Design an enzyme around this catalytic site. Structure first.
Site, PDB file in Angstrom:
ATOM      1  N   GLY A  30      -6.132  -2.424  -0.551  1.00  0.00           N
ATOM      2  CA  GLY A  30      -7.050  -3.405  -1.114  1.00  0.00           C
ATOM      3  C   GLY A  30      -8.139  -2.767  -1.963  1.00  0.00           C
TER       4      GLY A  30
ATOM      5  N   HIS B 229       0.059  -2.357 -10.802  1.00  0.00           N
ATOM      6  CA  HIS B 229       0.848  -2.617  -9.608  1.00  0.00           C
ATOM      7  C   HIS B 229       0.414  -3.910  -8.879  1.00  0.00           C
ATOM      8  CE1 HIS B 229      -1.925   0.241  -7.242  1.00  0.00           C
ATOM      9  NE2 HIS B 229      -2.092  -0.941  -6.656  1.00  0.00           N
TER      10      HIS B 229
ATOM     11  N   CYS C 155      -7.577  -0.617  -4.362  1.00  0.00           N
ATOM     12  CA  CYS C 155      -7.092  -0.369  -5.717  1.00  0.00           C
ATOM     13  C   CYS C 155      -7.860  -1.180  -6.764  1.00  0.00           C
ATOM     14  CB  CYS C 155      -5.583  -0.565  -5.814  1.00  0.00           C
ATOM     15  SG  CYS C 155      -4.629   0.426  -4.624  1.00  0.00           S
TER      16      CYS C 155
HETATM   17  C1  MVR Z   1       4.047   0.373  -6.565  1.00  0.00           C
HETATM   18  N1  MVR Z   1       3.003   1.278  -6.100  1.00  0.00           N
HETATM   19  C2  MVR Z   1       2.016   1.891  -6.838  1.00  0.00           C
HETATM   20  C3  MVR Z   1       1.266   2.617  -5.963  1.00  0.00           C
HETATM   21  C4  MVR Z   1       1.858   2.392  -4.682  1.00  0.00           C
HETATM   22  C5  MVR Z   1       1.387   2.855  -3.336  1.00  0.00           C
HETATM   23  N2  MVR Z   1       0.292   2.039  -2.824  1.00  0.00           N
HETATM   24  C6  MVR Z   1      -0.878   2.660  -2.500  1.00  0.00           C
HETATM   25  O1  MVR Z   1      -0.945   3.874  -2.347  1.00  0.00           O
HETATM   26  C7  MVR Z   1      -2.118   1.796  -2.369  1.00  0.00           C
HETATM   27  C8  MVR Z   1      -3.209   2.450  -1.556  1.00  0.00           C
HETATM   28  C9  MVR Z   1      -3.268   2.320  -0.176  1.00  0.00           C
HETATM   29  C10 MVR Z   1      -4.328   2.865   0.525  1.00  0.00           C
HETATM   30  C11 MVR Z   1      -5.304   3.536  -0.186  1.00  0.00           C
HETATM   31  N3  MVR Z   1      -5.270   3.691  -1.517  1.00  0.00           N
HETATM   32  C12 MVR Z   1      -4.234   3.151  -2.172  1.00  0.00           C
HETATM   33  C13 MVR Z   1       0.498   0.627  -2.709  1.00  0.00           C
HETATM   34  C14 MVR Z   1       0.150  -0.231  -3.756  1.00  0.00           C
HETATM   35  C15 MVR Z   1       0.487  -1.572  -3.696  1.00  0.00           C
HETATM   36  C16 MVR Z   1       1.175  -2.094  -2.600  1.00  0.00           C
HETATM   37  C17 MVR Z   1       1.624  -3.508  -2.586  1.00  0.00           C
HETATM   38  C18 MVR Z   1       1.685  -4.243  -1.403  1.00  0.00           C
HETATM   39  C19 MVR Z   1       2.220  -5.520  -1.439  1.00  0.00           C
HETATM   40  C20 MVR Z   1       2.667  -6.038  -2.636  1.00  0.00           C
HETATM   41  C21 MVR Z   1       2.552  -5.252  -3.768  1.00  0.00           C
HETATM   42  N4  MVR Z   1       2.043  -4.007  -3.765  1.00  0.00           N
HETATM   43  C22 MVR Z   1       1.483  -1.234  -1.545  1.00  0.00           C
HETATM   44  C23 MVR Z   1       1.150   0.107  -1.593  1.00  0.00           C
HETATM   45  N5  MVR Z   1       2.925   1.581  -4.776  1.00  0.00           N
END
Ligand code: MVR
Ligand code: MVR
Lengths: 304, 304
Positions: free
Chosen positions: A143, A41, A145
């Site tokens: 951040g 992602h 991830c």
């Molecule tokens: C597509 N997808 C896969 C998973 C998710 C959901 N997601 C999360 O849950 C990340 C998270 C947050 C807090 C604690 N742990 C994890 C997350 C991932 C990435 C982005 C992001 C932001 C800008 C541009 C691109 N991608 C935003 C949200 N979305």
């Protein structure tokens, strides 16, 4: 003596953490040999959260679009590929700090340490358990991830988890190092059911043996039970049914303390039916299920 | 989101751990620059547990009697000296893995990570707090002596604790890196009173703010209190009296959540007077006091 939620020394994993940037998005990567593993992602945009077509998105990206930095040194990307939900970025340099390592897929109930990371930098380490519903109750902000879960057998680091997502319920989901999600979770911004979470019965029992070793013995009673009777109580209290395999793994702890597993089950039964009555066990007012029998023996014998 | 008892990434400290042997006794040492710091009781024998005359014992020892091994490489000892309850072994080689570091003496209530070690090797890392009675509730077996407590500010490791002893009560005692014991403890096998332990009130309040940030808000109420009224309750429940300094340090958390410190004190008051009523806060059934206000902000903002 004393019992603590102890994590593995994170040094070997720290030396593997890098920062991966693709477009405006930045997350953590894992550098082992000449490969950098990170959540796929990283290639998504603010719109591609709801239903991203990863194959179509990745086609728009070249090796030069993935920026990998280890501290402050830039890694040259010579290959990129998608394996399930992880990206594998081939770099021209093998990580000099790559430890002996394995990619393993843990079972629900097993525990591992997480080295939380932001912008490729380590912030902290904590011990976690893969819940029976395949979620983890971590501490992860945006951040984080790419941060990984692991275990250590003397010199070999077994990487079991990669952080990908936080469910709308506040719990965490991610993959093994082959990009396979634990549980039914998908890497999309959609509401996802993390099923009913049950208590890891064999871990609570292992922790009751850790408590007895350390002096906390108030909960021990004059009773015994059977596997069938015990599971009737475990069922009612959403505990995992105890099997003969669980009993066998608790054998070293039963042998050490001289308290039979079914006798310890009877203590757990009374604790479930009556509660703690305002008392504590190993400085906890609830039944702890994040120490496997292996963890208890390791901590009570000083395995380095 | 999610809150965890997170320890610092231990990598910088791992690279400092060595094994120190003197006679038949072996413990851990801390190698920074060309000096190895370890507990002075490494020179004691099986008889010199009750009342050791460290000055007389150390006189019988030469540089060649102290064996320092880092992994499997032997360090050549060129000097030895006693500073309070620690030995300082000058070695002919500066530790190449010596990080930026400081020797600091923490205050009661402050927290730190411990990297538990055996035979100079890391077994695990956990977060601890220096109790108001200057003990620590750690996890330490025989051979763990010399293991250190520390904190990390980006690249600087502040070593605050060195493990020396386990009291007959099962709690732990040790020194700062200048060999000064925290509390009234002496490095002898004698029964020693670890005074009344009180709950670190400012840390419980910081943890209540961490819970509110993460969704656990059931405990919040329509009441407020005063510092004098609050301390009447804190006194009764063996909590540290809250001061204006404590209120000031909680300011960032009060500002973040919009819940006044005295309003949060009123929630803590009702929690002390009524209990949890079988509920949990951040997966805990008791009031947690091992997160300072600084720890809460660090974890809730992702400081690396
Ligand atoms: C597509 N997808 C896969 C998973 C998710 C959901 N997601 C999360 O849950 C990340 C998270 C947050 C807090 C604690 N742990 C994890 C997350 C991932 C990435 C982005 C992001 C932001 C800008 C541009 C691109 N991608 C935003 C949200 N979305
Ligand atoms: C003199 N003295 C200082 C402190 C103590 C008490 N002591 C400890 O409490 C160590 C400990 C144990 C488990 C967890 N944490 C710490 C301990 C130290 C060393 C020796 C020992 C054994 C053989 C030869 C020489 N010295 C035995 C006992 N005694």
């Amino acid at each position: 003596s004393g019992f603590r939620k102890m994590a593995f020394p994170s040094g070997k994993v720290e030396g593997c953490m890098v920062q991966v940037t693709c477009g405006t998005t930045t997350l953590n990567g894992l550098w082992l040999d000449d490969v950098v593993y990170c959540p796929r992602h990283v290639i998504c945009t603010s719109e591609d959260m709801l239903n991203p077509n990863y194959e179509d998105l990745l086609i728009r990206k070249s090796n030069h679009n993935f920026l990998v930095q280890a501290g402050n040194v830039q890694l040259r990307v010579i290959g990129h590929s998608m394996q399930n939900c992880v990206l594998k970025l081939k770099v021209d340099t093998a990580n000099p700090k790559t430890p002996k390592y394995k990619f393993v897929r843990i079972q629900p109930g097993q525990t591992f340490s997480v080295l939380a990371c932001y912008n490729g930098s380590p912030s902290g380490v904590y011990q976690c358990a893969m819940r029976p519903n395949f979620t983890i109750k971590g501490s992860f902000l945006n951040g984080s991830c790419g941060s990984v879960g692991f275990n250590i057998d003397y010199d070999c680091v077994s990487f079991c988890y990669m952080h990908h997502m936080e469910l709308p319920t506040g719990v965490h989901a991610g993959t093994d190092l082959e990009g396979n999600f634990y549980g039914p979770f998908v890497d999309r911004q959609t509401a996802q059911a993390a099923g009913t979470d049950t208590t890891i019965t064999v871990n609570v029992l292992a922790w009751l043996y850790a408590a007895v070793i350390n002096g906390d013995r108030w909960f021990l009673n004059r009773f015994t039970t059977t596997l069938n009777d015990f599971n009737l109580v475990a069922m009612k209290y959403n505990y995992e049914p105890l099997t003969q395999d669980h009993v066998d793994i608790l054998g070293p702890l039963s042998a050490q303390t001289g308290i039979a597993v079914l006798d310890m089950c009877a203590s757990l039964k009374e604790l479930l039916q009556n509660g703690m009555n305002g008392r504590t066990i190993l400085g906890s007012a609830l039944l702890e299920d994040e120490f496997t029998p292996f963890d208890v023996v390791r901590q009570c014998s000083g395995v380095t």
